[PDB]
Design a protein around this ligand. Structure first.
Ligand SMILES: [Fe+3]
Lengths: 859, 265
């Protein structure tokens, strides 16, 4: 292959072979890997001799060691690694990984490691079920080619496709550029000039950087171990291997001993003139000399112009600067080494970083230290070097390719240098970098819950008993009663204070809460609580007192909390950005309702008016659930007519929207159905007589509590998202605002072809019409085709509204037409951006909300 | 009257890992004591729980030696006292949960209701859909309940039929009981309606009909809640109508007999 057309044909045949090879099973790949490893191991000696003869550099014994490593250790590392099919499987979820192959790989082989790198890359390609093309260096081509053959035949003797390894017989710049542009992935090696072309070809690439590696020796180090390790690593393969130490920084305290140990074991220290001669010899015309790599110290000295003993192993020249101009501070693949003098550890760190930034940015660095007592220095070294491979007390040449001196390090050539060196791996290249992991996903569902306050006491006249329980099992000593001024002036809190004043409890009351409470009242209540420091909190008001008491509780237990941060909209309750603080250490919360249809005694919602702009912000979190819910009919037998009607209709809307909501389970379904039936059965009687019908009043309270639980566990919909804004803008009662919009939301939701759905996993398809049909069937209405039932339900709701004295349209409540029209455009946007809107099945748009508002106003 | 349920009840398919990750590491618990039986432990039904507690940093000890006997309960209490745990996980349903509750009482109160919420946090995970022992006792009430169908996919046919009939019986006596109120009435009615629809499907196909199994699990939990909170002709007439007030009882008993026949009683 020395021209374009033959190269294209080779790519075609390699793609055909890879297509067949990609479907092999685990056993076939294991057999092929085993046979190829056997052949490569058995042919270790001749390959090294051929490489040394052709390249003209290196040591035959070290090349034998390298080939034996690249066969045996590579086989041992990935001997029983799964790279075929399903790897991870979690039955609880629906995740599954398949690990498909990658494709054809364009591998670049350097001239320093002709055969070992080829063997390693071919083996890891065969294990991963990929094809490979080898582009040999022009200086070592033949040797590299031979290596590939030693594998290829063995592979096809185990069952591999015939053309699964390919090579370029005569490499050239245009051929290499073209072959890089064709293969799916490039596995490059050879430093700058080739890695840049690999990363600038249009296909994903995996290259390697190279350069200087600094070795640090400090005061508390094993001198013999450090010196001998440095000599071993530097002399291994005449330093022609990458990651070999290029400079050593020795502190002032042990400079003499280190120098003596270096000269004792075959090192030649250079004087000034010899140092200058070596400077001129190493770097010529600002480039590395090609006649120096892989040569012995004696050969380098003879090239320089002086003579050294034949047993010399390393030439050491002491220098002072670490800049670019210093020729001893550059990379040199030869046994020439430079030694620096450092005063303290920080100076050594500065020199090391200056020497690694200019040269091998991202490559190896090594330190020698006593890692028993000098723990701080080791951490300082670790948190300083821009180094992917930091070595401690380890020779760098055998430590960079780490399976010899350290374990749990991936044994491989092709040392990745990460983003610092312009690479994308930052790790030893293994088999997991040659795989395409693809995931299989199955439809799951969100976890649901049923959370209710504990100790919900349900009986008439039970407030004495539940309040007496406060002293026996709990034994509290301070009480704070939060109410409104109306009930406090009319003596609705007399039984509670009478019960508390019977025994040893000191109680204080706060009654400055107006309807539609403001946040300033919350601050006042929190300040009073802090001044008094109570142990229990009691809310004895229907709608506003519970919200006020909850917000004072929040501001009292955690005064540093912020309202706007705490009143943010979210999508998932368990995935909200802001997490409510725990509230169980200071006070005990008790809720005693007086208005039926609010449900706030069992639910985590609370609405608060800003008073800065006038917007009713609702906030919700399960940390607001009271620890005690006491419902008693005794304090609810004296409600007015309009208030009773508003509360009843609000409870009915609560139940309907809880049943219809997307977050609906059997629990809330049963609760909502029971509440819906009991509200229709008893509301008119309670509205008419009131004081003379205790049974109706008790049933209404029970239904209100059931509905409260129902929507506490299943969030509401768009009817409240509209009613909140409608009642905030025009001072309408909440129940009245709910009454005027329910019969339009029912028609809005009941659509078999909605524009949008509510994007919830368990909401498979539009089913709201069927739910309304079930409601109509349970309430006791007749019809057919699942359409007349909804209409009869709407008619029944309209009749119920007519029975409780609620008018028909917005205009009946004296709302100016011009004022309505001028603010509808701004009210629609606020209605859409509400917490409840995200739970409605249909997810309304702005125009549809505006149309619903217009229909409500004009009838 | 009253209404008492565990603090948290988590119900959905595949909810076991999320109910543990998002809370157990949040509370900072560090020691776990799993209590199961021989059969579940040998078949490996406790593997997901230990695997989840292995991903995060909790050490766990398993006691799989347990109709239960009081001697086994005392042995488990002694083992707990030796191990000194913080979280107690009860898996298996029925006898296993009662045994674990007794062990919890004797471990947190060795003097022997007293208040037992100091040393341990109790979690119940049922593998049967008939008892509903994770929501019923009031100082024996578990702190958390996790209900998922994955732990109950491969129940045998006879156990499935017995569990369904037990849940039906619990719901019927919860609705008929003298202490029953609106809450228990609604829960019992829902449980009965779900039992009269999915029990044959769960008994016939088994694991091949996961929807029926999940519905049976939910119905068992609802019936357990109703029985826990609530320990006549009009009542039975209303039940039959939901599914001259004298023939309705005959129709209901005929339907009960037909259901018993359908599950091979
Ligand atoms: Fe509301």
């Amino acid at each position: 292959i020395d021209n374009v057309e033959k190269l294209e044909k080779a790519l075609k045949r390699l793609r055909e072979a890879q297509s067949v090879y990609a479907t092999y099973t685990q056993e076939q790949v294991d057999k092929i890997f085993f046979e190829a490893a056997m052949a490569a191991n058995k042919m270790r000696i001749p390959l090294a001799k051929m490489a040394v003869e052709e390249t003209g550099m290196g040591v035959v014994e070290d090349k034998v060691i390298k080939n034996h490593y690249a066969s045996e250790y590579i086989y041992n590392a990935y001997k029983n690694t799964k790279t075929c099919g399903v790897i991870e499987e979690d039955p609880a979820f629906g995740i599954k990984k398949i690990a498909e192959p990658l494709g054809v790989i364009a591998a670049v082989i350097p001239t320093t490691n002709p055969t070992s790198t080829a063997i390693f890359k071919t083996l890891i390609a065969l294990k991963t079920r990929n094809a490979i093309i080898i582009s040999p260096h022009p200086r070592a081509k033949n040797s590299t080619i031979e290596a590939a053959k030693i594998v290829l035949e063995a592979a096809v003797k185990a069952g591999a496709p015939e053309g699964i390894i390919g090579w370029i017989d005569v490499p050239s710049l245009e051929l290499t550029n073209l072959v890089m542009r064709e293969a799916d992935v490039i596995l490059a090696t050879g430093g700058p000039g080739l890695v840049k072309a690999a990363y600038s070809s249009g296909k994903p690439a995996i290259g390697v950087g190279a350069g200087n590696t600094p070795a640090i020796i400090d005061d508390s180090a094993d001198i013999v171990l450090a010196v001998n390790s440095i000599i071993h690593s530097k002399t291994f393969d005449n330093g022609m291997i990458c990651a070999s130490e290029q400079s050593v920084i020795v502190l002032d305290g042990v400079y003499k001993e280190v120098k003596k140990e270096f000269e004792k074991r075959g090192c030649y220290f250079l004087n000034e003139d010899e140092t200058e001669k070596v400077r001129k010899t190493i770097i010529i015309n600002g480039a590395l000399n090609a006649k120096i790599v892989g040569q012995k110290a004696h050969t380098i000295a003879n090239l320089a112009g002086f003579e050294v003993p034949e047993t010399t192993k390393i030439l050491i020249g002491e220098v002072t600067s670490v800049d670019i101009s210093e020729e001893f501070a550059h990379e040199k693949l030869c046994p020439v080494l430079a030694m620096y003098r450092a005063k303290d550890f920080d100076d050594a760190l500065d020199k090391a970083e200056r020497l690694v930034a200019d040269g091998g940015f991202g490559h190896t660095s090594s330190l020698y230290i006593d890692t028993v007592t000098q723990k701080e220095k080791l951490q300082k070294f670790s948190e300083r070097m821009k180094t992917c491979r930091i070595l401690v007390n380890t020779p760098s040449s055998q430590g960079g390719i780490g399976d010899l001196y350290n374990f749990k390090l991936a044994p491989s050539l092709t040392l990745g240098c990460g983003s610092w060196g312009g690479n994308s791996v930052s790790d030893n290249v293994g088999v997991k970098h040659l795989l395409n992991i693809k995931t299989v996903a199955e439809r799951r569902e969100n976890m649901l819950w049923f959370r209710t306050p504990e100790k919900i006491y349900i009986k008439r006249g039970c407030l004495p008993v539940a309040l007496d329980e406060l002293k026996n099992v709990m034994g509290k000593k301070k009480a704070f009663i939060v109410t409104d001024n109306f009930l406090y002036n009319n003596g609705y809190t007399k039984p509670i204070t009478d019960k508390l004043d019977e025994m040893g409890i000191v109680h204080k009351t706060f009654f400055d809460v107006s309807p539609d409470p403001s946040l300033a009242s919350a601050k006042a209540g929190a300040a009073e609580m802090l001044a008094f420091q109570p142990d229990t909190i009691i809310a004895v008001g229907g709608g506003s007192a519970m919200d006020a008491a909850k917000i004072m509780w929040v501001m009292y237990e955690h005064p540093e909390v912020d309202f706007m941060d705490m009143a943010m909209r979210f999508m998932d309750i368990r995935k909200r950005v802001y997490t409510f603080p725990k509230m169980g250490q200071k006070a005990y919360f008790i809720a005693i309702p007086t208005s039926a249809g609010t449900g706030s005694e069992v639910t985590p919602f609370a609405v608060i008016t800003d008073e800065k702009t006038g917007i009713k912000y609702p906030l919700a979190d399960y940390e607001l659930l009271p620890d005690m819910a006491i419902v008693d009919a005794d304090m609810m037998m004296n409600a007015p007519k309009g208030l009773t009607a508003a509360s009843g209709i609000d409870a009915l809307t609560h139940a309907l929207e809880a049943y219809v909501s997307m977050l609906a389970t059997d629990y809330t379904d049963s609760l909502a159905l029971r509440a819906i039936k009991m509200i229709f059965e008893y509301l008119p009687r309670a509205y008419e007589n009131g004081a003379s019908d205790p049974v109706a009043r008790e049933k209404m309270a029970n239904a209100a509590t059931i509905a409260g639980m129902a929507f506490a566990n299943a969030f509401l919909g768009v009817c409240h998202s509209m009613a909140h804004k409608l009642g905030a803008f025009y001072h309408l009662p909440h129940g009245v605002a709910n009454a005027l919009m329910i019969n339009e939301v029912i028609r809005f939701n009941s659509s078999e072809a909605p524009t949008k759905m509510g994007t919830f996993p368990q909401y498979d398809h539009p089913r709201t019409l069927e739910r309304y049909a079930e409601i109509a069937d349970y309430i006791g209405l007749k019809g057919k085709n699942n359409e007349e039932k909804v209409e009869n339900l709407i008619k029944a709701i309209d009749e119920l509204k007519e029975k409780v004295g609620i008018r028909k349209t917005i205009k009946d409540y004296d709302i100016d037409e011009k004022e309505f029209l001028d603010r509808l455009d701004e009210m629609v946007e606020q209605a859409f951006d509400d917490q409840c809107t995200g739970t409605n099945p249909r997810y309304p748009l702005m125009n549809e909300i505006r149309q619903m508002y217009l229909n409500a106003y004009y009838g």
